[PDB]
Amino acid sequence: PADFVPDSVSGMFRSHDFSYLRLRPDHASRPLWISPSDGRIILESFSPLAEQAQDFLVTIAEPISRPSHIHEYKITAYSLYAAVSVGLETDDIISVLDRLSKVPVAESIINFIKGATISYGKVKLVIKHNRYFVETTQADILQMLLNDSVIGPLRIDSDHQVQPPEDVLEREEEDDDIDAVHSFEIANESVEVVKKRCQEIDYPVLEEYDFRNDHRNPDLDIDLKPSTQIRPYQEKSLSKMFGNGRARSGIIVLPCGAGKTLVGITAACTIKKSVIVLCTSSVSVMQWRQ
Amino acid sequence: KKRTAKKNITPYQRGIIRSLILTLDCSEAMLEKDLRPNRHAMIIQYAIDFVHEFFDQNPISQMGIIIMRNGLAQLVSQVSGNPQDHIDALKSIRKQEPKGNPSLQNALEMARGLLLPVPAHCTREVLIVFGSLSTTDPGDIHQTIDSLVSEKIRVKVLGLSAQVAICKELCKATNYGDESFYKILLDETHLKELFNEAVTPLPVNKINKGFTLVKMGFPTRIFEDTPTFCSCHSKLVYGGYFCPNCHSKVCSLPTVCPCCDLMLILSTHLARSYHHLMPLKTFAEVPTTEKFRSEDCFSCQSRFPILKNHKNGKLLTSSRYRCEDCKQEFCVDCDVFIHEILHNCPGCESK
Amino acid sequence: IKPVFERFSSVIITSGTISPLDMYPRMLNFKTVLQKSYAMTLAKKSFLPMIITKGSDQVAISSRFEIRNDPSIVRNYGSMLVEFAKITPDGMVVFFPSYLYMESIVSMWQT
Ligand SMILES: [Zn+2]
Ligand SMILES: [Zn+2]
Ligand SMILES: [Zn+2]
Ligand SMILES: [Zn+2]
């Protein structure tokens, strides 16, 4: 498959015991209580940094319980990817959680958090001459691109070309990561192989969508008017999906019938390239259009 | 490390009688989300609390409530001396929701009109709980402010999270120049104490003004029960008071006689006043190592004194905050209680 | 300038803003003695310089791009201005970099 199971891997990390599990020394002085084995975060009223802790937990995971006294924590692989893309420091976040949470930080949970902080939503995909290449702003991205079977083996040793970046961008890697770093140009055949390798070796790359570098695609007959309705969840989802500069292909669950396609229309206008729209059924397609 | 008032330097005069006309703020601004329900709900709740408190401590005054909706000042409680009416009015309002812009000018003019009947010995006042950051005036404002200060009408306002120049001018203007009355808040607890300090009478340094003897008389409770009959609400009420002079029944109150129109009181109101006039010297916190006094409380008998040499613990302080004139100790709880609730200093009473 | 520095002997230069205090000896080609700057000794903060480089979209903004529209920038600035108008009490100023800039910006703000 060309996709990685980790996106829908949410629903685990909830199980513990009392013999092997020791009492967290921070339990004596801990405004919250991050239950690691259960994946929970019992952030009682004693937490003075409750807002920041809740923000960090919602980024990294999904807070299942939000009681009046204390909160709850749940594990979500998609939530883990979102937290990794959040940009917070992994070590600093772990230290803050250990300080606030009375329970000590679990080994498996700590390792998952550390992996998500850098690896999760932090893959390196360099670009040369405004295209997709095998590199990374960080050191890890460049090593992965060099060792990538499709990124490296299918990537030409030339560091970057404006024309190759516009046309060929090992296919047109418009879904690559930040460009203008140490990287080398790649061909225009097999992005399917590249993404298959990324999902197989579990490489969540912070992808973008360089629409202006989509030189092959002429700008389609798009009227870039945002006059359609905008909603708070809609605009925040747009902010999340557009990422930095160029947009990116992503997944966002939305309330259907509540202006779900509005953000999609806005993004399609934003890229100013060839876009198509799909709804459930053709009759439903007409109904949504009307 | 202490947070105490250094000294009270007007312990000679206050306005004992009052006629305070609290004016709320019910306008679109008060609907933002900074205080837990909103501005507005929390405001009205604390307003109820303040009404109870103020009509307790100043039980001889009146009060009227004013809102500011849609740029209009709509009186919601006539100036009256019965707390329950105002309480009910606020109850009613709290279920209604704000709109329009706050028209400070209109509210001011409505007040100035409202307080005309108040006689000379009675003192006027207003308390704007201003919440927004603008006004919308249908006239000159400095005109009104000048009329106000001409009519000897002190004004105190409690802005929300900002400072508005005109309001600062307003407070500085009416209060004989001495600017201290535009206190604005930074926290809910700060707000509670704001209202609390609004409760007391208000001195700064009073100009020499007319001081006037006021006729009033005290009633005597009635006895009969079935003869229920009232001359202030025209009902049957199982027994009340008698004006000493008008000589007509009046349902329970410190109210004004509705027949011959003279003030009625028992004394306990006058006792509250006495408490406000001449308070105590602020209790001093005894020196940590220089006290060498009795190891107990005095009014109470607490065991919270010291610890005798404990590196940092004893180096901290010696809970012996002791009043001056009687020069007897008192634990922190006792001193807080004396200076808050009952003002007869225990030891200073006894000699 | 040269004639006045030739004519007069004791002259002063003063402003609440001059910086750096060496460009002026360079450009105007004149001799000085005391080039001193004074520090605001305050027992309190008293003012909050800031550099709002990124709007809500966390996007770098300026007027440098053009003298034109780019609805991202426009909407960002408009949001900035309106939230300030909500928050500050009476009295606020802005200083656009050039007149045509203001003309276009406000025209399409009214848009
Ligand atoms: Zn009656
Ligand atoms: Zn009478
Ligand atoms: Zn005691
Ligand atoms: Zn005493």
Side-chain angles (χ1 to χ4, degrees), chain B residues 104 140-146 148-149 153 155-157 163-182, chain C residues 90:
Chain B
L104 168 64
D140 171 359
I141 167 163
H142 308 73
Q143 166 54 235
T144 44
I145 285 187
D146 221 1
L148 233 66
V149 54
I153 294 198
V155 170
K156 173 177 194 306
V157 343
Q163 177 174 29
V164 194
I166 177 58
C167 294
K168 136 84 152 301
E169 175 50 43
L170 173 48
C171 312
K172 174 179 174 60
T174 90
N175 303 336
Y176 318 158
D178 270 335
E179 147 50 50
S180 184
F181 290 44
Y182 179 56
Chain C
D90 46 358

Short mmCIF file of all heavy atoms in Angstrom, two decimals, chain B residues 104 140-146 148-149 153 155-157 163-182, chain C residues 90:
data_model
loop_
_atom_site.label_atom_id
_atom_site.label_comp_id
_atom_site.label_asym_id
_atom_site.label_seq_id
_atom_site.Cartn_x
_atom_site.Cartn_y
_atom_site.Cartn_z
N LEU B 104 -23.03 57.29 28.41
CA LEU B 104 -22.63 57.82 29.70
C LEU B 104 -23.28 59.17 29.97
O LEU B 104 -23.73 59.44 31.08
CB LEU B 104 -21.12 57.97 29.74
CG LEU B 104 -20.60 58.78 30.90
CD1 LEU B 104 -20.94 58.06 32.16
CD2 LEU B 104 -19.12 58.90 30.76
N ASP B 140 -23.15 68.00 24.70
CA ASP B 140 -21.88 68.29 25.33
C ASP B 140 -21.80 67.52 26.63
O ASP B 140 -22.78 67.40 27.36
CB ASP B 140 -21.74 69.79 25.59
CG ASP B 140 -20.52 70.14 26.45
OD1 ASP B 140 -19.76 69.24 26.87
OD2 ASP B 140 -20.33 71.34 26.70
N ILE B 141 -20.62 67.00 26.93
CA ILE B 141 -20.45 66.32 28.20
C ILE B 141 -19.88 67.26 29.25
O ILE B 141 -20.40 67.32 30.36
CB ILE B 141 -19.56 65.08 28.01
CG1 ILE B 141 -19.12 64.56 29.36
CG2 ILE B 141 -18.38 65.43 27.18
CD1 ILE B 141 -18.63 63.18 29.30
N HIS B 142 -18.85 68.03 28.90
CA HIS B 142 -18.28 68.94 29.87
C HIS B 142 -19.32 69.91 30.39
O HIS B 142 -19.24 70.35 31.54
CB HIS B 142 -17.11 69.69 29.25
CG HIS B 142 -16.11 68.79 28.61
ND1 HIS B 142 -16.36 68.14 27.42
CD2 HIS B 142 -14.87 68.41 29.00
CE1 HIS B 142 -15.31 67.41 27.10
NE2 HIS B 142 -14.39 67.55 28.04
N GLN B 143 -20.33 70.20 29.58
CA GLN B 143 -21.49 70.90 30.10
C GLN B 143 -22.06 70.16 31.30
O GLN B 143 -22.27 70.75 32.37
CB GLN B 143 -22.55 71.03 29.02
CG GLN B 143 -23.88 71.44 29.56
CD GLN B 143 -23.77 72.68 30.38
OE1 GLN B 143 -24.18 72.71 31.54
NE2 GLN B 143 -23.21 73.73 29.79
N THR B 144 -22.32 68.87 31.14
CA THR B 144 -22.94 68.11 32.23
C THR B 144 -22.03 68.06 33.43
O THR B 144 -22.48 68.21 34.56
CB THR B 144 -23.28 66.71 31.78
OG1 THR B 144 -22.18 66.18 31.03
CG2 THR B 144 -24.51 66.75 30.93
N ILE B 145 -20.74 67.82 33.21
CA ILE B 145 -19.81 67.69 34.32
C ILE B 145 -19.81 68.99 35.10
O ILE B 145 -19.78 69.00 36.33
CB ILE B 145 -18.40 67.34 33.83
CG1 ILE B 145 -18.36 65.88 33.43
CG2 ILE B 145 -17.40 67.60 34.91
CD1 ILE B 145 -16.99 65.43 33.11
N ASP B 146 -19.83 70.11 34.38
CA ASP B 146 -19.87 71.38 35.07
C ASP B 146 -21.15 71.53 35.87
O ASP B 146 -21.13 71.98 37.01
CB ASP B 146 -19.72 72.51 34.07
CG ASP B 146 -18.82 73.60 34.58
OD1 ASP B 146 -18.32 73.44 35.71
OD2 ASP B 146 -18.63 74.59 33.86
N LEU B 148 -22.87 69.16 37.16
CA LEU B 148 -22.71 68.24 38.26
C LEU B 148 -21.97 68.92 39.38
O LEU B 148 -22.54 69.20 40.44
CB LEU B 148 -21.94 67.01 37.82
CG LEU B 148 -22.62 65.70 38.12
CD1 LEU B 148 -23.87 65.62 37.31
CD2 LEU B 148 -21.66 64.63 37.74
N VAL B 149 -20.71 69.25 39.13
CA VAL B 149 -19.90 69.85 40.18
C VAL B 149 -20.57 71.09 40.72
O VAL B 149 -20.36 71.45 41.88
CB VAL B 149 -18.49 70.13 39.67
CG1 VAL B 149 -18.55 70.95 38.44
CG2 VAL B 149 -17.69 70.86 40.72
N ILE B 153 -22.09 66.91 43.59
CA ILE B 153 -22.47 65.52 43.37
C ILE B 153 -21.20 64.72 43.10
O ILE B 153 -20.73 64.64 41.96
CB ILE B 153 -23.47 65.37 42.22
CG1 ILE B 153 -24.77 66.04 42.62
CG2 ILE B 153 -23.69 63.94 41.89
CD1 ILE B 153 -25.92 65.60 41.80
N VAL B 155 -18.78 61.64 42.36
CA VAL B 155 -18.95 60.50 41.47
C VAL B 155 -17.73 59.62 41.54
O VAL B 155 -16.60 60.13 41.52
CB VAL B 155 -19.18 60.95 40.02
CG1 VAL B 155 -19.11 59.77 39.13
CG2 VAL B 155 -20.51 61.58 39.90
N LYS B 156 -17.94 58.32 41.61
CA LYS B 156 -16.87 57.34 41.63
C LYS B 156 -17.19 56.29 40.58
O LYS B 156 -18.33 55.83 40.50
CB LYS B 156 -16.75 56.69 43.00
CG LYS B 156 -15.78 55.55 43.06
CD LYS B 156 -15.67 55.02 44.48
CE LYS B 156 -14.47 54.11 44.65
NZ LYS B 156 -14.44 53.00 43.67
N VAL B 157 -16.22 55.92 39.76
CA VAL B 157 -16.50 54.95 38.71
C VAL B 157 -15.46 53.85 38.74
O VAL B 157 -14.31 54.05 39.15
CB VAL B 157 -16.56 55.60 37.32
CG1 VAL B 157 -16.72 57.07 37.44
CG2 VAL B 157 -15.35 55.26 36.54
N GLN B 163 -8.29 52.26 30.75
CA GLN B 163 -8.51 53.57 31.33
C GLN B 163 -9.01 54.53 30.26
O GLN B 163 -8.36 54.70 29.23
CB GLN B 163 -7.23 54.13 31.96
CG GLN B 163 -7.40 55.52 32.49
CD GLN B 163 -6.19 55.99 33.24
OE1 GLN B 163 -5.08 55.57 32.95
NE2 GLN B 163 -6.40 56.86 34.22
N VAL B 164 -10.15 55.16 30.51
CA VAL B 164 -10.76 56.08 29.57
C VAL B 164 -10.52 57.49 30.06
O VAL B 164 -10.77 57.80 31.23
CB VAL B 164 -12.26 55.81 29.42
CG1 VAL B 164 -12.80 56.54 28.22
CG2 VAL B 164 -12.50 54.34 29.30
N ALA B 165 -10.04 58.35 29.17
CA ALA B 165 -9.63 59.68 29.59
C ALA B 165 -10.79 60.47 30.17
O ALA B 165 -10.65 61.13 31.20
CB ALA B 165 -9.02 60.43 28.42
N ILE B 166 -11.95 60.42 29.52
CA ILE B 166 -13.05 61.25 29.97
C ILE B 166 -13.49 60.84 31.37
O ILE B 166 -13.78 61.69 32.21
CB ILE B 166 -14.22 61.20 28.98
CG1 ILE B 166 -15.38 62.01 29.53
CG2 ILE B 166 -14.66 59.79 28.75
CD1 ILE B 166 -15.01 63.44 29.80
N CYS B 167 -13.55 59.54 31.64
CA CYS B 167 -13.95 59.12 32.98
C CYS B 167 -12.96 59.61 34.02
O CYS B 167 -13.36 60.04 35.11
CB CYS B 167 -14.06 57.60 33.03
SG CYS B 167 -15.37 56.91 32.01
N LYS B 168 -11.67 59.53 33.71
CA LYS B 168 -10.67 60.04 34.63
C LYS B 168 -10.90 61.51 34.89
O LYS B 168 -10.83 61.97 36.04
CB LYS B 168 -9.28 59.80 34.07
CG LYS B 168 -8.35 60.96 34.21
CD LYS B 168 -7.70 60.96 35.55
CE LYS B 168 -6.36 61.63 35.46
NZ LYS B 168 -5.50 60.91 34.48
N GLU B 169 -11.21 62.26 33.84
CA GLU B 169 -11.52 63.66 34.03
C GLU B 169 -12.74 63.82 34.91
O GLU B 169 -12.80 64.71 35.75
CB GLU B 169 -11.76 64.33 32.69
CG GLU B 169 -12.21 65.74 32.85
CD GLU B 169 -11.31 66.50 33.79
OE1 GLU B 169 -10.08 66.36 33.69
OE2 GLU B 169 -11.84 67.24 34.64
N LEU B 170 -13.72 62.95 34.73
CA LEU B 170 -14.97 63.06 35.47
C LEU B 170 -14.75 62.91 36.96
O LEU B 170 -15.15 63.77 37.77
CB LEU B 170 -15.92 62.00 34.94
CG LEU B 170 -17.23 61.83 35.66
CD1 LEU B 170 -17.84 63.16 35.85
CD2 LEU B 170 -18.09 60.99 34.77
N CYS B 171 -14.09 61.82 37.35
CA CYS B 171 -13.79 61.60 38.75
C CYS B 171 -12.92 62.72 39.30
O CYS B 171 -13.22 63.28 40.35
CB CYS B 171 -13.09 60.26 38.94
SG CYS B 171 -13.88 58.92 38.09
N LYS B 172 -11.85 63.07 38.59
CA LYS B 172 -11.01 64.15 39.06
C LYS B 172 -11.79 65.44 39.21
O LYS B 172 -11.46 66.27 40.05
CB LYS B 172 -9.84 64.35 38.11
CG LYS B 172 -8.97 65.54 38.42
CD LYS B 172 -7.83 65.65 37.44
CE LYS B 172 -7.03 66.92 37.64
NZ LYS B 172 -6.45 67.00 39.00
N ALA B 173 -12.84 65.61 38.43
CA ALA B 173 -13.53 66.89 38.42
C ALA B 173 -14.47 67.01 39.60
O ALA B 173 -14.38 67.96 40.38
CB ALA B 173 -14.30 67.07 37.12
N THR B 174 -15.40 66.07 39.74
CA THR B 174 -16.42 66.28 40.76
C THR B 174 -15.84 66.20 42.16
O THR B 174 -16.23 66.96 43.04
CB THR B 174 -17.55 65.28 40.61
OG1 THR B 174 -17.23 64.13 41.38
CG2 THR B 174 -17.69 64.89 39.18
N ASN B 175 -14.89 65.29 42.39
CA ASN B 175 -14.38 65.10 43.74
C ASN B 175 -13.37 66.16 44.13
O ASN B 175 -12.25 65.82 44.54
CB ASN B 175 -13.73 63.73 43.86
CG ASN B 175 -14.67 62.65 43.53
OD1 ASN B 175 -15.87 62.81 43.62
ND2 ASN B 175 -14.14 61.52 43.13
N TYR B 176 -13.73 67.42 44.01
CA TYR B 176 -12.93 68.53 44.51
C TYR B 176 -11.49 68.43 44.04
O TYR B 176 -10.57 68.86 44.72
CB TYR B 176 -12.96 68.60 46.03
CG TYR B 176 -14.30 68.37 46.65
CD1 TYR B 176 -14.39 67.96 47.97
CD2 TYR B 176 -15.47 68.57 45.95
CE1 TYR B 176 -15.60 67.74 48.56
CE2 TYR B 176 -16.69 68.35 46.52
CZ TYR B 176 -16.75 67.93 47.83
OH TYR B 176 -17.97 67.71 48.43
N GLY B 177 -11.29 67.83 42.88
CA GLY B 177 -9.97 67.73 42.30
C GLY B 177 -9.20 66.53 42.73
O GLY B 177 -8.52 65.90 41.92
N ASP B 178 -9.29 66.17 44.01
CA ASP B 178 -8.42 65.13 44.52
C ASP B 178 -8.74 63.81 43.84
O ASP B 178 -9.75 63.17 44.12
CB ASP B 178 -8.55 65.00 46.05
CG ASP B 178 -7.58 65.90 46.81
OD1 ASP B 178 -6.51 66.23 46.24
OD2 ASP B 178 -7.86 66.26 47.97
N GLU B 179 -7.87 63.41 42.92
CA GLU B 179 -8.09 62.22 42.12
C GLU B 179 -7.65 61.00 42.92
O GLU B 179 -6.46 60.80 43.16
CB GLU B 179 -7.33 62.32 40.80
CG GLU B 179 -6.80 61.01 40.25
CD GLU B 179 -7.85 59.94 40.20
OE1 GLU B 179 -8.94 60.22 39.68
OE2 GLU B 179 -7.60 58.84 40.73
N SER B 180 -8.61 60.21 43.36
CA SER B 180 -8.32 58.85 43.77
C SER B 180 -9.44 57.89 43.43
O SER B 180 -9.34 56.71 43.78
CB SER B 180 -8.04 58.78 45.27
OG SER B 180 -7.68 57.46 45.63
N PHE B 181 -10.49 58.34 42.76
CA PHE B 181 -11.76 57.64 42.76
C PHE B 181 -12.04 56.94 41.45
O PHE B 181 -13.12 56.37 41.29
CB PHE B 181 -12.88 58.62 43.05
CG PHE B 181 -12.90 59.11 44.46
CD1 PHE B 181 -11.74 59.49 45.09
CD2 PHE B 181 -14.08 59.22 45.14
CE1 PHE B 181 -11.77 59.94 46.38
CE2 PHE B 181 -14.11 59.67 46.43
CZ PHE B 181 -12.95 60.03 47.05
N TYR B 182 -11.10 56.94 40.52
CA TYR B 182 -11.29 56.26 39.25
C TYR B 182 -10.63 54.89 39.27
O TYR B 182 -10.10 54.42 38.27
CB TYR B 182 -10.74 57.11 38.11
CG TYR B 182 -10.88 56.46 36.76
CD1 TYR B 182 -12.09 56.03 36.31
CD2 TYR B 182 -9.78 56.23 35.97
CE1 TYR B 182 -12.22 55.43 35.10
CE2 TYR B 182 -9.90 55.63 34.76
CZ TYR B 182 -11.13 55.23 34.33
OH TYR B 182 -11.25 54.62 33.11
N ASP C 90 -9.57 55.61 24.08
CA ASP C 90 -9.66 56.69 23.12
C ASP C 90 -8.28 57.15 22.66
O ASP C 90 -7.40 57.41 23.48
CB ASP C 90 -10.41 57.84 23.74
CG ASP C 90 -9.94 58.13 25.12
OD1 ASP C 90 -9.05 57.39 25.58
OD2 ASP C 90 -10.45 59.06 25.76
#
